[PDB]
Design an enzyme around this catalytic site. Sequence first.
Site, PDB file in Angstrom:
ATOM      1  N   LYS D  12     -46.240  14.904 -16.228  1.00 54.90           N
ATOM      2  CA  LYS D  12     -45.266  15.577 -17.111  1.00 54.90           C
ATOM      3  C   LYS D  12     -44.839  16.816 -16.592  1.00 54.90           C
ATOM      4  CE  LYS D  12     -45.282  14.448 -20.961  1.00 54.90           C
ATOM      5  NZ  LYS D  12     -44.595  13.155 -21.552  1.00 54.90           N
ATOM      6  N   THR D  57     -48.462  10.603 -19.282  1.00 54.71           N
ATOM      7  CA  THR D  57     -47.676  11.870 -18.926  1.00 54.71           C
ATOM      8  C   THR D  57     -48.156  12.694 -20.175  1.00 54.71           C
ATOM      9  OG1 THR D  57     -45.472  11.584 -19.902  1.00 54.71           O
ATOM     10  CG2 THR D  57     -45.849  10.787 -17.693  1.00 54.71           C
ATOM     11  N   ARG D 170     -21.588  47.058   6.132  1.00 59.11           N
ATOM     12  CA  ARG D 170     -21.234  46.237   5.121  1.00 59.11           C
ATOM     13  C   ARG D 170     -22.216  46.114   4.025  1.00 59.11           C
ATOM     14  NH1 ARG D 170     -22.740  40.173   7.459  1.00 59.11           N
ATOM     15  NH2 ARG D 170     -25.297  40.935   7.466  1.00 59.11           N
ATOM     16  N   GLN D 213     -30.522  37.157   9.367  1.00 55.86           N
ATOM     17  CA  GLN D 213     -31.552  36.442   9.774  1.00 55.86           C
ATOM     18  C   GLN D 213     -32.550  37.501  10.276  1.00 55.86           C
ATOM     19  OE1 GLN D 213     -28.356  35.580  10.276  1.00 55.86           O
ATOM     20  NE2 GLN D 213     -28.130  33.732  10.919  1.00 55.86           N
ATOM     21  N   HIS D 241     -21.814  37.106  -0.428  1.00 55.51           N
ATOM     22  CA  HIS D 241     -20.634  38.117  -0.095  1.00 55.51           C
ATOM     23  C   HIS D 241     -19.824  39.129  -1.007  1.00 55.51           C
ATOM     24  CE1 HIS D 241     -20.795  34.582   2.819  1.00 55.51           C
ATOM     25  NE2 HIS D 241     -21.264  35.496   3.423  1.00 55.51           N
TER      26      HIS D 241
HETATM   27  O1  LIG Z   1     -25.587  37.937   8.464  1.00 53.12           O
HETATM   28  C1  LIG Z   1     -24.902  37.267   8.817  1.00 53.12           C
HETATM   29  N1  LIG Z   1     -25.470  35.948   9.577  1.00 53.12           N
HETATM   30  C2  LIG Z   1     -24.590  34.971   9.872  1.00 53.12           C
HETATM   31  O2  LIG Z   1     -25.144  33.994  10.495  1.00 53.12           O
HETATM   32  C3  LIG Z   1     -23.091  35.232   9.333  1.00 53.12           C
HETATM   33  N2  LIG Z   1     -22.205  34.201   9.546  1.00 53.12           N
HETATM   34  N3  LIG Z   1     -21.273  35.098   8.724  1.00 53.12           N
HETATM   35  N4  LIG Z   1     -21.590  36.096   8.079  1.00 53.12           N
HETATM   36  C4  LIG Z   1     -22.907  36.185   8.714  1.00 53.12           C
HETATM   37  N5  LIG Z   1     -23.600  37.197   8.206  1.00 53.12           N
HETATM   38  O1  LIG Z   2     -43.200   4.471 -19.142  1.00 54.33           O
HETATM   39  C1  LIG Z   2     -43.967   5.372 -19.221  1.00 54.33           C
HETATM   40  N1  LIG Z   2     -44.643   5.936 -18.020  1.00 54.33           N
HETATM   41  C2  LIG Z   2     -45.385   6.801 -18.195  1.00 54.33           C
HETATM   42  O2  LIG Z   2     -46.004   7.247 -17.157  1.00 54.33           O
HETATM   43  C3  LIG Z   2     -45.641   7.522 -19.339  1.00 54.33           C
HETATM   44  N2  LIG Z   2     -46.410   8.460 -19.997  1.00 54.33           N
HETATM   45  N3  LIG Z   2     -46.033   8.295 -21.288  1.00 54.33           N
HETATM   46  N4  LIG Z   2     -45.240   7.715 -21.691  1.00 54.33           N
HETATM   47  C4  LIG Z   2     -44.909   6.977 -20.737  1.00 54.33           C
HETATM   48  N5  LIG Z   2     -43.905   5.797 -20.341  1.00 54.33           N
END
Ligand SMILES: O=c1[nH]c(=O)c2nn[nH]c2[nH]1
Ligand SMILES: O=c1[nH]c(=O)c2nn[nH]c2[nH]1
Lengths: 287, 287, 287, 287
Positions: D12, D57, D170, D213, D241
């Site tokens: 779930k 679930t 920048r 980086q 940007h």
């Molecule tokens: O910080 C940056 N890293 C990159 O690899 C890059 N490429 N364009 N601008 C950039 N700026």
């Molecule tokens: O098809 C289903 N699978 C599950 O695992 C499930 N759990 N509740 N209802 C369900 N129905």
Amino acid sequence: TKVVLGQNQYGKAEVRLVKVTRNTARHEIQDLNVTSQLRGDFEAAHTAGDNAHVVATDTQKNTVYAFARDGFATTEEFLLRLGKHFTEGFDWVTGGRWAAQQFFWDRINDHDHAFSRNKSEVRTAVLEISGSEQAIVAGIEGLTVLKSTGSEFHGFPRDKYTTLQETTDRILATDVSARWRYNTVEVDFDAVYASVRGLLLKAFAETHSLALQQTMYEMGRAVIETHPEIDEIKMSLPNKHHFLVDLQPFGQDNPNEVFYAADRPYGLIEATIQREGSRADHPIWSN
Amino acid sequence: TKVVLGQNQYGKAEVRLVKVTRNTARHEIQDLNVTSQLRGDFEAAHTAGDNAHVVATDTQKNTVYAFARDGFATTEEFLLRLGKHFTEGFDWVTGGRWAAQQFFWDRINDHDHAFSRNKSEVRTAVLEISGSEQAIVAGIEGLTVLKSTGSEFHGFPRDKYTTLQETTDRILATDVSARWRYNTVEVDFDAVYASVRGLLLKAFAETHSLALQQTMYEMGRAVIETHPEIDEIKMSLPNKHHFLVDLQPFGQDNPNEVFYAADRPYGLIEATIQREGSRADHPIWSN
Amino acid sequence: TKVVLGQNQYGKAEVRLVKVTRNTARHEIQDLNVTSQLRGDFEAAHTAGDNAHVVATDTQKNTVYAFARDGFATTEEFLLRLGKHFTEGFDWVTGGRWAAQQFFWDRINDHDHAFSRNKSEVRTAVLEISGSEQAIVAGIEGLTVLKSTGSEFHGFPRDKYTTLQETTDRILATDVSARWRYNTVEVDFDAVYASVRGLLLKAFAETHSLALQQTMYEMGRAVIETHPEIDEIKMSLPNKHHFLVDLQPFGQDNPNEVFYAADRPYGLIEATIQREGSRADHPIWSN
Amino acid sequence: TKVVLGQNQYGKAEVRLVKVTRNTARHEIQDLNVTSQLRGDFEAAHTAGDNAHVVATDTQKNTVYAFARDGFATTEEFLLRLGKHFTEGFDWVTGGRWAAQQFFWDRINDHDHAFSRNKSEVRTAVLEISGSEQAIVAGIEGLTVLKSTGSEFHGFPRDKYTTLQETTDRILATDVSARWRYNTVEVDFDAVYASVRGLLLKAFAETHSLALQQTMYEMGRAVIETHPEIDEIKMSLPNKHHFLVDLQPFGQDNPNEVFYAADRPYGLIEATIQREGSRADHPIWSN
Ligand SMILES: O=c1[nH]c(=O)c2nn[nH]c2[nH]1
Ligand SMILES: O=c1[nH]c(=O)c2nn[nH]c2[nH]1
Ligand SMILES: O=c1[nH]c(=O)c2nn[nH]c2[nH]1
Ligand SMILES: O=c1[nH]c(=O)c2nn[nH]c2[nH]1
């Protein structure tokens, strides 16, 4: 038979702007998402393809960056400038709508030029000009709040489609979306946004809620009573349900501790809290 | 001074409903995202926390599924039923706003009970009841279209902020968000929706565009002229910019073939096309 | 202690490209979201800041558009070309990963140059090169399907926390995300994509499901049995629950007609269906 | 001809849990999005539809809530309890993958039971059990950072598709997404999370960057040198940007002040920084 062009507007939406203030070594950051749209006589543009009156949306975008170069004190100020420039710059332009979102940034370890984003809330502002009249609506959105207790809901009607059980202890969770209209442009925009925010949060937290509606009303009341420059405040608050899980089938109880946070559906409560005697339905709300 | 409670509404938003029709082996699917909100006298609920008037949002949610059981011919019909139920079932409830998104499904190779979701467009509908009046606005959204040629833009003003180059051949792409208000509730909803959708696409594709505004006008005009039950149609069309990449620095030309599809910003052209003299001020457009 | 630069890769992600083919009056459209990352000796770039080996992400972006000018027959052939260029044009680049999403468009009433997007599914392809080795993975995603009947789930263990009831009639809905690895690059990429999609849809629809697990196995079984060039197919299928609503509290029955489509949580059933003996953990699945 | 079932897992996904600690007046909030998946022998479930081995679930979801009742000190501890319970509770279940997202809340004005969501980052945890082995990878994502200067990029290769201009000043902005693998389950999970978060932030801000980086390398190095319990840390950093707008066409200069924050494309720089002599490619990284 007789077709007519009704209300209309056009421009550049969502222009992402970042303005760095680096006159001193202590850099400042201003981040906005700006939208510019014009209103006026664009009859021929729609009906004949005559673009003589069409100030290019690209041009509106260009103006945003050009004006930014001069810096601005607040978001409302910047919007006010764009509005006056376009309305006064062109005869066929009688007004328009200028909005922006303001994104908050905090310094990293009080660094001179290193920041991290504060995504807990987004500030908004809308400017609408119509002829000689102006109007500004400031707002807040995306701010999520929750009370683990101090909230109840009971005494509601019960028809054959009613299964909800009354309660005196539950969770109250919502996203604060509020917008207030200023009754004047001479306002300390940053100070008031900060104040309004604080008032909303306090009212949400300290009010013992008997209903989200009641809580919302109190939040709205605090703002109106505190600020003379605001005529009204609108809010759209979802009731984000946190269901108390039933563990009794497993021989376990749940004293208001384990909850399931449901996505949809959700209650949606909205309302306008205004200053008695203030205008009923201002045009700025029509969008 | 005196804080007053203005316009307000509440209910359950986004109730996802899937109605399967299977009286015969040939199954039918109706997928909806329903929203119900009520309007009326909720003065006490807001100022005193007195919920005697508060039909639970949970109850509204329950009414949606209960009603779905009986089935519904169309989305608009289903909403009219919900609206009539709450306004007429409670004295303090004098109106409301019921909306929904309708999702489309196609059979997998004409199978009787197996389907695949058609996500190319989303159908909408909003019912607003104001006492005796019931206004219905249907719509379409999420329908993206594009013309690779047969679109130009030139003749626009050139101020000091203008850099845009005129063109007689560019790409025109937008997301068709259209909404129309019916002047009568006696409408063959499904047939009109299919017709409107076809008129919108036809007009967009067959109109030699001199601007997005002219295309939109032709799109709206076609709808208003064909359907007398429609008073106005509003459209919000973004100009999804596809920039012809400059390949010259690489020693190559670009005869309108290689494009960069930008996310933001984008032009946003909006307008209302309507029957002369109609109510282009209806409250339903306030949401 | 001692720090060692491990696995690493870099490039430009999500380069939105649109290629219009307009030799005849009848235009064609190819829409892709391309990602290009390189792998090799970038020790000095990370440890020393020496960018001698860093072919700019910007350069990679430009190459994508430049190559687009010459046109491409399929998405896979576009990636193959991109990958050969970077591994061969730089001695320090020993390989990398090139991915792309392909969006489909349909003509509006068989119009020469006007289209609308088909958002019902998104096609994918991934190319990985490692020195002399080269592998391709094609896929499909975002394709929602649903069976209203012909689905059961019973016979599972009932531990102390099991409340799920056995059923012989339920809705089975999922999003089909499937990725298959070719054992050779000599493939009619477009024909095979069409085929696999058809087989998955068919296997989903026709198999009387006793479990999402069983259904998924058959889907993959048909694929491997039909295409010799495919070595394995991986699927990730959420069980998008549609709960049969309980209307008995309202005095109604519910003969498998009214459902509530929940957002979260959701079952997530995943598995790899492969040709007996084929590899167990190809590096391409490592990303 | 012969099809075989390869790797597989099911469970779930996205179980939204909110655990309130209130045995005192000072309430505590734990908020998680949990995913539970089992690995073992499910050959028959897939091949024949025999669910005797299929722990529903729905049951896995129930367990998450039943267990939450007791409370848990950390997200990782809670995941370990789930992992242990399922592997030991069923013979055919020999392993699994339990993942969780932890969302943070801040008290509203130090209030006892009222909070506001801190959305500036999301904490992650992935526990994978394989027989007697249990690996845990913790992480952070959604944390946006930006340097308005103190960053450059020059000395890179230049081919016919290279147009990027070298720079000594920048903006360097990214989304900090990092995952580190523990070499032991004996860790102060919360203290290390905070420590690593601060180290990433500090290394990012203070390192005079010659390339994204290089910055990432220093971030990884600080974490590895600082915490003995970490064998390696992986980072995926996009280069968001911010283009310096050309304002010359408007009669202005742009001394590194006005920027356009593009959505896409974006550089995607990724690398793994590990403790010397540590394991090359742990399976947990394959998910
Ligand atoms: O910080 C940056 N890293 C990159 O690899 C890059 N490429 N364009 N601008 C950039 N700026
Ligand atoms: O098809 C289903 N699978 C599950 O695992 C499930 N759990 N509740 N209802 C369900 N129905
Ligand atoms: O605060 C609330 N208002 C409502 O109208 C409602 N309906 N259900 N729960 C509710 N809570
Ligand atoms: O179709 C268009 N309409 C406009 O108003 C516009 N402005 N720039 N590009 C434009 N394209």
